[PDB]
RNA sequence: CAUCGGUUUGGAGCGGCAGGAUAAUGGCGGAGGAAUGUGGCACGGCUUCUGCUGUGUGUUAUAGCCUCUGACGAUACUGCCA
RNA sequence: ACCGAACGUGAAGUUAAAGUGCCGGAAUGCACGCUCAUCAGACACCACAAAAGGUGUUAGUUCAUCUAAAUGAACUAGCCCUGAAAAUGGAUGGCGCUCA
RNA sequence: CGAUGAUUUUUGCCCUGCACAUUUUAGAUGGAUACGAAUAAGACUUUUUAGUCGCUGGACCAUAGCAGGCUGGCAACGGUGCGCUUAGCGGAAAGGCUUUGUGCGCUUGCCGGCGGAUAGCAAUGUCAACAUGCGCGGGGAUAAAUCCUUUGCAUACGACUUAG
């Protein structure tokens, strides 16, 4: 027999299913839609939450009751230093989605993102890019083709880059590292930039 | 039945000429050029002189053969719209609030846009057709001219402008403003 | 002009010159209907039979009225020597070489594969000194 | 030469069978390039042999054998029915097998 | 090849009151002749109050056709039973002989009017000889001055499964 | 009719569930496929009707559990997939084993854009259908359902079209001096002798 | 592998004989006829009569067709062959 | 429980009813038509459909008007469309099929 | 399903030239032989007029030699295998397509000389790619994860985020 009242869903089924994130940083599922015409820029950053406070404004909406009125509003600090950006990898159309085709690391990796690599930091040798190191030490030459191929196949262009976390108060070393999207200009704009 | 043979003659007249070739018909006169794409027809085509065409449905069913005089309308209508030209008439109607009509340009396109119909805020604009013209009459008040080669764009564009101005919630009996077409013909009658 | 490409097919219309079982050549008579014609030739028997079972050639036989009967077509197909006409054709040669193709012995299909090597050191000798 | 093949290529179709029930002691045949009653009586009483690897050598050799002939034709697009001394076993659906040319009438 | 057509000649068997019974005779389209002689007596139990086991077949004969490669125009006269009741109807047929105008015949009113076999009954097959008798545009538009057609469209049959070159239709 | 290693489809103008009949067979009789440019499919019908039925399959899914349901699959190989796999005894290790011998691609990936692609005529639409009949390109339907990389598929196609071209104009070239070679030789004793051969 | 005996499925099988309207056709010979009327001829709108073309007339002409029929000769179909 | 056929253990041959695009042994076989459906249709028992409509298309019947280039009326019955609404997602057995 | 970092001072690991040997195989036994598009259309020629072609791949390429041996000559300056080397192109799953020069062969384009027997009148009468292992040669590189303690951005327990 039918519900004998009709009342709403209990929760939303698009949320589904309510278990445990894969992992603790969050994800960029999509970034914004690539406009060639715009100035290259990144389109993502890093940082950490550090807490709420209290604010007082003027509110400015013509026909509201608050127009031209002190209004309290709650608001969120979020502890942003620079980030560092580390590399760079491109991304090339496939009738299967989007395929990473390269990725280009910088010489030169602070200890904080060389932590990233490593599950027992105290027990290693530290190796992590260390070879890599020698491939601009020769001439670069390597490295230079690697960006030459973004270049010439990528049609999406992200760089690396990595939080400064021991410029905040937590008491993690490892630094966060992430892929922000670059976006505006064209590919080769793009690894320019990078 | 499937009727062995039909046939239909085009007339072609003195300044124009029909290239047809894989079902692609070319109609160049002084006016200028238009082309159509029939190749979701099955029709053969036969030069008969440089004044005629046969246009031919072997062994057609009467749906078929019912597509055969719609080809030879459609490349007559070609013909006599690079001649002659296309011109359709519209007039203003409304009983209190006048309705402003002006042709613009917004990002380089041409619109037509209606303000005051019916005393509404809203501002209709609809797109003016590549290779048509509007034009408000300046002898004829309250007239909206539509102009061009291809009657297809011609007509479907007027049409547009007529079906943007309807009525809601009202009897239309009553209420009989609009955007009407008053005249159908050619440029050069 | 104009200039407007017309269709080359090939009617169906009596003096048309026709391949039967792949085999025999034939002239449609008369026209029974959309699907069946009546056809005769010297090599053949008179018949009634369907345009699906045979095949219409470039060929035609001229000015052979309409409903003529076998002593007429035979007299109007010598006269035009229609069978020439036909073995001319590069149909009729393919035909035939593959005719010939399928009686040879096994030594003749051995001659064959010396021959084309003698023939593939020449082509290669002219085709660099091209 | 290069090729030295004196047999005609086969394929293990299936049993002899119904709907629901099939035949082991007959087995159904594809003759390569034939396509018709016609040509496939040519190859009436031929004998066939399905030749496979093992894991275990015998007299040196992990080759082995299974013989049979063709005895009849099956349907009407050329394919035809044949009898092995044992039954091809049905993980050979698919299988090449090798129609001799003997015993011989050319 | 389907149909025959046989002349059934049959009588009543002869009595005292009538020693020389008069002879009757039907044209009959059948498959062989125990069929001939079948419609033969089902038509006579019809037509006349005549029963098959006080009577006999006199004589059973094949009528060929007399221009067998000679076309020609038939009109054909009909009854016939639909779902809903019994109807008269006239159509028109080319072919070189009787047998096949009538074998059309059958193929056409199964197809159109869903008409078995066992629901026609042939009035009359007339070998039309004027073109003027031509009264249906569905064979009379074959009977124009130097019709010609074309056949668009050719499909090849092949004998392979897979073919390695694109395929064409003309013809 | 032959016995080929691999047999490579070329999936422009075919009827679905014709070249999916013949695939089936092929593949149960140890035959190899592969078919490619699978957005070029074709199924009779007008696209209206044939989208009504893509909807009416979406709409069959397991009540208690969707996950559990029936996966529909929107790629136009993926579709063809469905037809081929509803005519295999797929439940079954013969089955499986018919089906690992298949493989269905969207364009014409590497690589198989050098390799011939063969036809087959018993499923072409253009030789199948009557000329007046109304079809659908399954690349549209597979669009029209959540497909995603329609235009990506036709950028890749464009260019290998170009490459393909060029490749196509250099055979040719090389074929007509070929030609003009063999022409240089004829009426010889061995091409007299050939001729008489039949060859 | 060969040959035999029993059962059985085949071949593009080959050949002899019989029947029928002692096939009907066709081919050849004779008489009669007409049209979806060939040649000829006349009237034309278009082709520098460059299949021009259409319409009329009438009956083999610079094509043919249909009906009836005379004497020969086959074939199809059906059946038989110890 | 219907159709076919009734059963010792086997070899070979041939069938019944039912079938021969794939699942599945056997033809994408030969042939004449009909049908296009934004709820087509698809095999007895059997897993239903009616009264009633259609200028969709096909073939027929009977009248009538026309050079003093064909058309007008009424009707018949085939396939197709409307009439045709139920509860988990789903069943011509499935795939799929449109000169099938 | 992809990109990328680091991969054991153990005699363990990587790459690479061989040689011998073992397992495996949904099933080698000359060659998977590359335009695109239309189909009431294509192509070629002269020209946009006409002619011709297809009407199946029963095609094309390859194909002779102890499963292909050993030796001689003629004509050609070609064809072809392997091997170093050169230049370009290919990112859809490129892993392939070409290309320069150069050393060792082969050539059935033509003509010779020598060998095959007895596996007995057939018996797959054994000739493949892929993988792995073991022996030599050549080079090359020299880590981490978990337990444990810790944290509380986490937590029923596992798991997770941290630090050592
Ligand atoms: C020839 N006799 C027909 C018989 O075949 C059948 O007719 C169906 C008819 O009922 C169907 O039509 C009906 O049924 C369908 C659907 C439920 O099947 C509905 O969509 C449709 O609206 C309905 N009118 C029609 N689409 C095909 C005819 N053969 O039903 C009985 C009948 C009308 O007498």
Redesign the interface.
């Known amino acids: 027999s039918h519900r004998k009242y009709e009342a709403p869903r209990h929760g939303s089924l698009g949320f589904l299913p309510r278990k445990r994130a894969a992992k603790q940083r969050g994800r960029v599922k999509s970034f914004p839609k690539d406009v060639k015409s715009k100035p290259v820029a990144l389109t993502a950053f890093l940082g950490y939450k550090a807490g709420m406070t209290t604010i007082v404004r003027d509110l400015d909406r013509p026909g509201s009751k608050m127009h031209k009125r002190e209004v309290v509003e709650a608001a969120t600090v979020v502890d942003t230093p620079p980030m560092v950006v580390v590399g760079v990898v491109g991304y090339v159309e496939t009738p299967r989605g989007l395929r990473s085709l390269t990725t280009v690391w910088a010489e030169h990796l602070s200890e904080e993102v060389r932590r990233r690599f490593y599950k027992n930091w105290y027990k290693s040798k530290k190796k992590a890019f260390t070879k890599y190191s020698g491939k601009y030490a020769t001439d670069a030459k390597q490295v230079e083709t690697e960006l030459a191929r973004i270049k010439k196949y990528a049609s999406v262009v992200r760089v690396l880059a990595h939080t400064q976390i021991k410029k905040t108060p937590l008491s993690q070393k490892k630094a966060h590292l992430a892929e922000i999207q670059i976006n505006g200009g064209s590919v080769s704009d793009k690894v320019d930039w990078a | 039945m499937k009727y062995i043979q039909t046939d239909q003659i085009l007339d072609i007249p003195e300044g124009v000429t029909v290239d047809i070739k894989a079902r692609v018909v070319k109609v160049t006169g002084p006016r200028g050029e238009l082309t159509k794409d029939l190749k979701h027809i099955d029709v053969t085509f036969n030069k008969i002189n440089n004044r005629a065409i046969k246009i031919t449905v072997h062994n057609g069913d009467r749906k078929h053969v019912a597509a055969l005089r719609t080809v030879k309308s459609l490349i007559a209508n070609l013909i006599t719209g690079v001649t002659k030209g296309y011109k359709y008439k519209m007039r203003f109607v409304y009983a209190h609030f006048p309705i402003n009509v002006n042709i613009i340009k917004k990002d380089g396109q041409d619109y037509v846009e209606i303000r005051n119909f019916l005393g509404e805020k809203r501002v209709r604009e609809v797109k003016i057709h590549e290779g048509v013209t509007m034009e408000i009459s300046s002898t004829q008040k309250d007239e909206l001219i539509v102009s061009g080669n291809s009657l297809e764009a011609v007509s479907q564009n007027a049409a547009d402008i007529q079906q943007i101005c309807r009525v809601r919630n009202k009897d239309i009996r009553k209420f009989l403003d609009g955007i009407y077409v008053s005249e159908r013909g050619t440029i050069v009658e | ?7 080359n ?5 009596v003096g048309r010159v026709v391949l039967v079982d792949n085999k025999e050549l034939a002239t449609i008579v ?5 699907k ?1 014609v ?1 056809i ?1 030739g010297p090599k053949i028997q ?3 039979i369907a ?1 699906a079972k045979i095949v ?1 050639t470039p060929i035609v036989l001229p000015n052979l009225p309409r ?1 003529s009967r076998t002593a007429t077509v035979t007299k109007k197909w010598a006269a035009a020597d229609i069978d020439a006409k036909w073995a001319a054709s590069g149909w009729a040669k393919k035909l035939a ?5 399928s009686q ?1 012995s096994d030594f ?1 299909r051995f ?2 594969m010396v ?2 090597k ?2 593939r050191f ?3 000798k ?2 660099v000194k ?1 | 030469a290069e090729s030295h093949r004196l047999y005609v290529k086969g394929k293990h179709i299936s049993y002899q069978r119904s709907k629901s029930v099939t035949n082991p002691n007959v087995s159904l045949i594809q003759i390569e390039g034939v396509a018709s009653p016609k040509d496939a009586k040519f190859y009436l009483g031929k004998r066939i042999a399905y030749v496979y690897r093992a894991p275990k050598e015998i007299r040196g050799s992990k080759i082995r054998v299974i013989w049979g002939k063709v005895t009849r034709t099956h349907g009407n697009n050329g394919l035809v029915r044949a009898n092995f001394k044992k039954n091809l076993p049905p993980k050979t659906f698919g299988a090449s097998v090798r129609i001799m040319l003997y015993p011989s009438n050319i | 090849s389907r149909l025959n057509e046989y002349q059934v000649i049959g009588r009543n068997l002869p009595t005292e009151s009538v020693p020389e019974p008069k002879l009757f005779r039907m044209r009959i389209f059948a498959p062989n002749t125990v069929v001939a002689k079948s419609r033969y007596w089902y038509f006579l139990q019809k037509l006349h109050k005549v029963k098959k086991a006080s009577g006999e077949i006199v004589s059973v004969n094949i009528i060929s056709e007399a221009k067998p490669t000679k076309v020609k125009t038939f009109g054909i006269w009909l009854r016939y039973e639909s779902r809903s009741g019994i109807h008269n109807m006239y159509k028109e047929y080319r072919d070189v002989t009787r047998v096949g105008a009538v074998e059309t015949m059958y193929q056409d009113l199964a197809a159109r009017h869903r008409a078995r076999f066992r629901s026609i009954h042939i009035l009359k097959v007339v070998e039309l000889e004027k073109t003027d008798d031509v009264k249906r545009q569905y064979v009379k538009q074959f009977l124009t001055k130097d019709l010609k057609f074309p056949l668009p469209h050719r499909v090849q049959k092949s004998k392979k499964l897979f073919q390695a070159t694109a395929p064409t239709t003309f013809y | 009719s032959s016995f080929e290693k691999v047999v490579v489809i070329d999936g422009k103008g075919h009827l679905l569930g014709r070249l999916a009949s013949i695939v089936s067979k092929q593949i149960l009789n140890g035959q190899k496929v592969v078919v490619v440019r699978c957005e070029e499919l074709n199924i009779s019908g007008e696209f209206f009707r044939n989208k009504l039925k893509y909807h009416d399959y979406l709409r069959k899914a397991t009540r208690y559990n969707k996950k559990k349901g029936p996966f529909h699959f929107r790629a136009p190989s993926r579709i063809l997939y469905k037809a081929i796999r509803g005519m295999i005894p797929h439940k079954t290790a013969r089955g499986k084993a018919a089906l690992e011998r298949l493989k269905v691609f969207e364009g014409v990936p590497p690589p198989y854009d050098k390799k011939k692609r063969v036809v087959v005529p018993q499923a072409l639409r253009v030789l199948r259908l009557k000329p007046g009949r109304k079809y659908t390109t399954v690349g549209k339907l597979s669009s029209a359902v959540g497909w995603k990389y329609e235009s990506v598929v036709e950028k890749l196609e464009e260019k290998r079209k170009v490459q393909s071209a060029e490749y196509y104009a250099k055979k040719k070239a090389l074929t007509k001096k070929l030609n003009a070679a063999k022409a240089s030789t004829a009426e010889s004793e061995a091409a007299q002798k050939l001729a008489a051969f039949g060859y």
């Open positions: 002009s104009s200039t407007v490409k017309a269709a097919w090939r009617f169906v219309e008369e026209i029974i209907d959309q069946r009546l005769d008179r018949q009634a345009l219409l409903g070489n593959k005719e010939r193709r040879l003749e001659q064959v021959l084309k003698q023939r020449a082509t290669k002219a085709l091209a």
